[PDB]
Amino acid sequence: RRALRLGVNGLPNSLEPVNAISNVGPRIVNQIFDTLIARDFFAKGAPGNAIDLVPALAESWERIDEKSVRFKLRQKVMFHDGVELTADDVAYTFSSERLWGPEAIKKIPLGKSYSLDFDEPVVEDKYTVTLRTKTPSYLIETFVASWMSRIVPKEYYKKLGAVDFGNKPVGTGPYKFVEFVAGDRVVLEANDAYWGPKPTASKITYQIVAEPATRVAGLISGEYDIITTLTPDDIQLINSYPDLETRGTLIENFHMFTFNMNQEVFKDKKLRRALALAVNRPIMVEALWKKQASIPAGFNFPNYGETFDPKRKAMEYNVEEAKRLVKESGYDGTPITYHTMGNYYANAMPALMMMIEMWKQIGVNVVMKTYAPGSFPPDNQTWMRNWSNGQWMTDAYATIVPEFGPNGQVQKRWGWKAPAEFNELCQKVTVLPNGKERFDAYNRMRDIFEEEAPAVILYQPYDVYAARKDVHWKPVSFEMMEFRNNLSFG
Ligand SMILES: O=C(O[C@H]1[C@H](OP(=O)(O)O[C@@H]2[C@@H](O)[C@@H](O)CO[C@H]2O)[C@@H](CO)O[C@@]1(CO)O[C@H]1O[C@H](CO)[C@H](O)[C@@H](O)[C@H]1O)c1ccccc1
């Protein structure tokens, strides 16, 4: 088998699966670990966007009541060190101690904020485990299929601790750990004892190449087989090669810009809203994304299923209202910084440069502050910054509630003083089954989000990869790379 070499835009700081949640972690952690329930993005000839859920580490599952799901596990599954997977490892993965309890915050900072209102799991036998919530939750199934739910080995994890585990991970996945050189590379090797489809590459290397031009040059020179995070602008040039091609797809994620609302200038919604109203998204999508990116109608996406609102109007663009809001605000003309880690996000810098011109027309001076990986300053030295959110559930709960809710980082760390009505609705949607009340509450939350502007949604990016034609691999509609039944050579 050939070794697979990947040129990437970044690497996570840890291989602990929850801590690795980002645009750069899942493409690695998806190889090392498995979940109880998995997604088959290729079901019924779908071009990597199928919503179909399939058994993975759990052979079957059944909802027992409004707050519990019982799982029957695959038998004789081995972690990379030969230890058999049991309900003990599954219970530990979803425990108060490791994930959501008070004693877990130090090791997994976002564990509690991203988790459901869990109750301690119940081990029925070696291969049977019930995952449950303290209050009703119809989200257990989607949570278990998500990036929050990769299964860790209890004994090995406890022995090492979360920090050391993140540097030497052990999972049940098709590829096993070889090396992790901080801010440089990750090397994995084929796990030939894998329970599912046998790995088709002998090794996988993820090498950071921060500059996209240098990344493209690496593919051309033959240093990489696949490269990530390109722009629709690179398409014509790569495709002009007989042996190279681009492969892209819209992903279930949105790019945005956000604010440090602890800062005096951003304490009030007025300037935040003015900045949002001046963003001409169609011109950015046309010029930088070649119409391949999509602009959502608010914090509202098709993957939400029953909680997606297809009748929702597009987000308002109003330069004249933006001009009035700036005039009425306390803003003087002082430059406002916008922090960006080069092009960690595809089109981060060209998008920002277009927005700086748009904002100059409304009387707001915004200045780009580009920083290197590991150079993100303390919070009080930041004003505006870019971000993204992967829409990780088949429900509107994610990411409006875990990120922007009362228990989330936007309110707790970034100082968004959310209206009381918003937090009340966040609590309601957590416990309610689908219906008119729940559907209407998400719409009211979307209206408040647009009015308050704690963040400004830009678009769903069109994720662009480039590969050698002799490397058969299709992208999926999520911020990760899938190699199961989706990687072959020659
Ligand atoms: O830029 C990355 O993370 C990004 C991550 O944002 P992503 O858009 O990639 O991932 C989001 C998630 O945050 C979550 O909302 C779910 O959906 C996902 O798409 C996030 C957490 O790792 O912090 C970020 C924000 O720009 O970064 C910010 O916070 C870190 C602080 O330790 C960085 O080191 C800083 O440089 C700084 O830029 C990153 C780069 C290298 C190592 C680790 C993370």
Coordinates of C-alpha atoms in Angstrom, one line a residue, residues 187-468:
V187 CA 1.8 10.7 11.1
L188 CA -0.7 7.8 11.3
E189 CA -0.3 4.2 10.1
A190 CA -2.8 1.5 9.0
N191 CA -4.6 -0.3 11.8
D192 CA -4.8 -3.7 10.2
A193 CA -6.9 -5.1 13.1
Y194 CA -9.7 -2.6 12.3
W195 CA -13.3 -4.0 12.7
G196 CA -14.6 -2.1 9.6
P197 CA -13.2 -1.7 6.0
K198 CA -9.5 -2.4 6.0
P199 CA -7.3 0.8 5.6
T200 CA -6.1 1.3 2.0
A201 CA -3.0 3.5 2.8
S202 CA 0.1 2.2 4.7
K203 CA 0.5 5.6 6.3
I204 CA -1.1 9.0 6.4
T205 CA 0.9 12.2 7.0
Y206 CA -0.7 15.7 7.7
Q207 CA 1.9 18.4 7.1
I208 CA 1.0 22.1 7.9
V209 CA 1.6 24.4 4.9
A210 CA 0.1 27.7 6.1
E211 CA 0.4 29.6 2.8
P212 CA -2.0 28.3 0.1
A213 CA 0.4 29.1 -2.8
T214 CA 3.2 27.0 -1.1
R215 CA 0.5 24.2 -0.5
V216 CA -0.4 24.2 -4.3
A217 CA 3.3 24.2 -5.2
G218 CA 3.7 21.1 -2.9
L219 CA 0.9 19.2 -4.8
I220 CA 2.5 20.2 -8.2
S221 CA 6.1 19.2 -7.1
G222 CA 4.6 15.8 -5.9
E223 CA 5.3 16.4 -2.1
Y224 CA 1.5 15.9 -1.4
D225 CA -1.2 13.6 -2.8
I226 CA -4.1 15.8 -1.5
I227 CA -4.1 19.4 -0.3
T228 CA -6.9 21.2 1.6
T229 CA -8.5 24.6 2.1
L230 CA -8.2 26.2 -1.4
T231 CA -10.4 28.8 -3.0
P232 CA -12.6 28.7 -6.1
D233 CA -9.9 31.0 -7.6
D234 CA -7.3 28.1 -7.6
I235 CA -9.7 25.8 -9.7
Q236 CA -8.8 26.8 -13.3
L237 CA -5.0 26.6 -12.7
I238 CA -5.0 23.2 -10.9
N239 CA -7.5 21.7 -13.5
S240 CA -5.2 22.8 -16.4
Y241 CA -3.0 19.8 -15.3
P242 CA -3.6 16.4 -17.0
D243 CA -2.7 14.6 -13.7
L244 CA -4.2 17.0 -11.1
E245 CA -7.8 18.0 -10.2
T246 CA -9.9 19.9 -7.7
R247 CA -12.6 18.2 -5.7
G248 CA -15.0 20.4 -3.7
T249 CA -18.3 20.5 -1.9
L250 CA -20.5 22.9 0.1
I251 CA -20.0 21.9 3.8
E252 CA -22.3 22.0 6.8
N253 CA -20.5 24.9 8.4
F254 CA -20.7 28.7 8.2
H255 CA -17.9 31.3 8.2
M256 CA -18.5 34.4 10.3
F257 CA -17.0 37.3 12.0
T258 CA -17.6 38.0 15.7
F259 CA -16.8 40.5 18.4
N260 CA -15.1 40.8 21.8
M261 CA -18.2 42.3 23.6
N262 CA -16.1 42.9 26.8
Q263 CA -14.6 45.8 24.7
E264 CA -16.3 49.2 25.2
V265 CA -16.9 49.8 21.5
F266 CA -18.8 46.4 21.2
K267 CA -20.8 46.4 24.5
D268 CA -23.9 47.8 22.6
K269 CA -25.6 46.1 19.6
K270 CA -25.8 49.3 17.5
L271 CA -22.3 49.3 15.9
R272 CA -22.4 45.5 15.7
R273 CA -25.7 45.7 13.8
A274 CA -24.4 48.5 11.6
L275 CA -21.3 46.4 10.6
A276 CA -23.6 43.5 9.8
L277 CA -26.0 45.7 7.7
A278 CA -23.1 46.9 5.5
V279 CA -21.8 43.4 4.5
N280 CA -22.6 42.9 0.8
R281 CA -22.6 39.0 0.8
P282 CA -23.7 38.5 -2.8
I283 CA -20.8 40.5 -4.2
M284 CA -18.3 38.6 -1.9
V285 CA -19.8 35.2 -3.0
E286 CA -19.7 36.2 -6.7
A287 CA -16.1 37.7 -6.6
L288 CA -14.3 35.3 -4.2
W289 CA -16.3 32.1 -4.3
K290 CA -17.4 32.0 -8.0
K291 CA -21.1 31.6 -6.8
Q292 CA -20.1 28.2 -5.2
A293 CA -20.6 29.4 -1.5
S294 CA -24.1 29.7 -0.2
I295 CA -25.7 32.5 1.9
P296 CA -28.1 31.1 4.5
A297 CA -31.4 32.8 5.5
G298 CA -30.2 33.5 9.1
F299 CA -28.8 30.9 11.6
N300 CA -30.8 28.3 9.7
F301 CA -29.5 25.3 7.7
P302 CA -31.0 22.4 5.7
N303 CA -29.3 19.8 8.0
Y304 CA -31.5 21.0 10.9
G305 CA -34.3 18.8 9.3
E306 CA -37.6 19.5 11.2
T307 CA -36.1 22.7 12.6
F308 CA -34.9 24.1 9.2
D309 CA -37.1 27.0 8.1
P310 CA -37.2 27.0 4.2
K311 CA -39.6 30.0 4.2
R312 CA -37.1 32.3 5.9
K313 CA -36.3 35.6 4.2
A314 CA -32.6 36.4 3.3
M315 CA -30.6 38.5 5.9
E316 CA -31.1 42.2 5.4
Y317 CA -28.4 44.3 3.5
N318 CA -28.9 48.1 4.2
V319 CA -26.0 50.6 3.7
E320 CA -28.2 53.6 4.5
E321 CA -29.5 52.1 7.8
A322 CA -25.8 51.1 8.6
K323 CA -24.7 54.8 7.9
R324 CA -27.5 56.1 10.3
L325 CA -26.5 53.6 13.0
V326 CA -22.8 54.6 12.9
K327 CA -23.8 58.4 13.1
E328 CA -26.0 57.7 16.2
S329 CA -23.4 55.4 17.9
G330 CA -20.5 56.5 20.2
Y331 CA -17.9 55.5 17.5
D332 CA -15.4 58.3 16.7
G333 CA -13.3 56.9 13.8
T334 CA -10.6 55.1 15.8
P335 CA -9.3 52.0 14.0
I336 CA -10.9 48.7 15.0
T337 CA -8.7 45.6 14.8
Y338 CA -9.9 42.4 13.1
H339 CA -7.8 39.4 14.0
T340 CA -7.2 36.7 11.4
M341 CA -4.7 33.7 11.4
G342 CA -3.7 34.3 7.7
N343 CA -5.9 32.0 5.5
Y344 CA -6.7 29.3 8.2
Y345 CA -10.2 29.9 6.8
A346 CA -10.4 29.8 2.9
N347 CA -10.7 33.4 1.6
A348 CA -10.2 34.9 5.2
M349 CA -8.0 37.7 3.9
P350 CA -9.7 38.6 0.5
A351 CA -13.2 38.5 2.4
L352 CA -11.8 40.9 5.1
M353 CA -10.2 43.2 2.5
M354 CA -13.6 43.5 0.7
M355 CA -15.4 44.1 4.1
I356 CA -12.8 46.8 5.1
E357 CA -13.9 48.8 1.9
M358 CA -17.6 48.2 2.6
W359 CA -17.1 49.5 6.2
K360 CA -15.0 52.5 5.1
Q361 CA -18.2 53.5 3.0
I362 CA -20.3 53.5 6.3
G363 CA -17.6 55.5 8.3
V364 CA -16.0 52.6 10.2
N365 CA -12.2 52.1 10.0
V366 CA -11.3 48.4 10.3
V367 CA -7.6 47.3 10.3
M368 CA -6.4 43.7 9.6
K369 CA -4.2 42.2 12.3
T370 CA -2.8 38.9 10.9
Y371 CA -1.1 36.5 13.3
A372 CA 0.9 33.2 13.2
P373 CA -0.4 29.9 14.8
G374 CA 0.2 30.1 18.5
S375 CA 0.3 34.0 18.4
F376 CA -3.4 34.6 19.3
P377 CA -3.2 37.4 21.8
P378 CA -5.0 37.6 25.3
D379 CA -8.8 38.3 24.8
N380 CA -8.5 42.0 25.9
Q381 CA -6.1 42.7 23.0
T382 CA -8.8 41.6 20.4
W383 CA -11.9 43.4 19.0
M384 CA -13.2 41.7 15.8
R385 CA -12.1 38.3 14.7
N386 CA -13.2 35.6 12.2
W387 CA -14.6 32.1 13.2
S388 CA -16.7 29.3 11.9
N389 CA -19.3 26.9 13.3
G390 CA -19.8 23.3 12.1
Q391 CA -23.6 22.5 12.2
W392 CA -23.0 19.2 14.0
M393 CA -26.5 17.8 14.7
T394 CA -29.6 16.9 12.6
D395 CA -31.3 19.7 14.6
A396 CA -31.2 23.5 15.1
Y397 CA -29.9 23.0 18.7
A398 CA -26.3 23.1 17.3
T399 CA -24.6 25.5 17.2
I400 CA -26.9 28.3 18.3
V401 CA -27.4 26.8 21.8
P402 CA -23.8 25.4 22.6
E403 CA -22.0 28.5 21.2
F404 CA -24.5 31.4 21.7
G405 CA -26.6 30.0 24.6
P406 CA -26.5 31.0 28.3
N407 CA -23.9 28.2 29.1
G408 CA -21.8 29.0 26.0
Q409 CA -18.5 30.9 25.3
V410 CA -20.0 33.9 23.3
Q411 CA -21.9 35.0 26.5
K412 CA -19.5 33.7 29.2
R413 CA -16.0 34.4 27.7
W414 CA -16.8 37.0 24.9
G415 CA -19.3 39.1 27.0
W416 CA -22.5 39.0 24.9
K417 CA -25.2 40.3 27.2
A418 CA -28.0 38.3 25.5
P419 CA -31.6 39.4 26.1
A420 CA -33.4 37.3 28.8
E421 CA -36.0 36.1 26.2
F422 CA -33.1 34.5 24.2
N423 CA -31.8 32.5 27.1
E424 CA -35.4 31.4 28.1
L425 CA -36.0 30.1 24.5
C426 CA -32.6 28.2 24.7
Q427 CA -33.8 26.3 27.8
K428 CA -37.2 25.5 26.1
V429 CA -35.7 24.1 22.8
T430 CA -33.3 21.8 24.9
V431 CA -36.2 19.7 26.4
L432 CA -39.1 20.1 23.9
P433 CA -40.0 17.5 21.3
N434 CA -40.4 18.7 17.8
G435 CA -43.6 20.7 17.1
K436 CA -45.0 24.2 16.6
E437 CA -43.8 25.7 19.9
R438 CA -40.1 24.4 19.3
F439 CA -40.1 25.5 15.6
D440 CA -41.4 29.0 16.5
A441 CA -38.9 29.4 19.4
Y442 CA -35.9 28.7 17.0
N443 CA -37.3 31.4 14.6
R444 CA -37.6 33.9 17.5
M445 CA -34.0 33.0 18.5
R446 CA -32.9 33.6 14.8
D447 CA -34.6 37.1 14.9
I448 CA -32.9 38.0 18.2
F449 CA -29.5 36.8 16.8
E450 CA -29.9 39.0 13.7
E451 CA -31.0 42.1 15.8
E452 CA -28.2 41.6 18.5
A453 CA -25.4 40.7 16.0
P454 CA -23.1 38.8 18.6
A455 CA -21.6 37.3 15.4
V456 CA -22.4 38.0 11.7
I457 CA -23.0 35.0 9.4
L458 CA -21.1 35.3 6.1
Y459 CA -21.8 32.1 4.2
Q460 CA -21.4 28.3 4.0
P461 CA -18.0 27.8 2.4
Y462 CA -17.4 25.7 -0.7
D463 CA -14.6 23.5 0.7
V464 CA -12.0 23.1 -2.1
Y465 CA -9.4 20.3 -2.2
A466 CA -6.9 19.4 -4.9
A467 CA -5.5 15.9 -5.6
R468 CA -3.5 13.7 -8.0

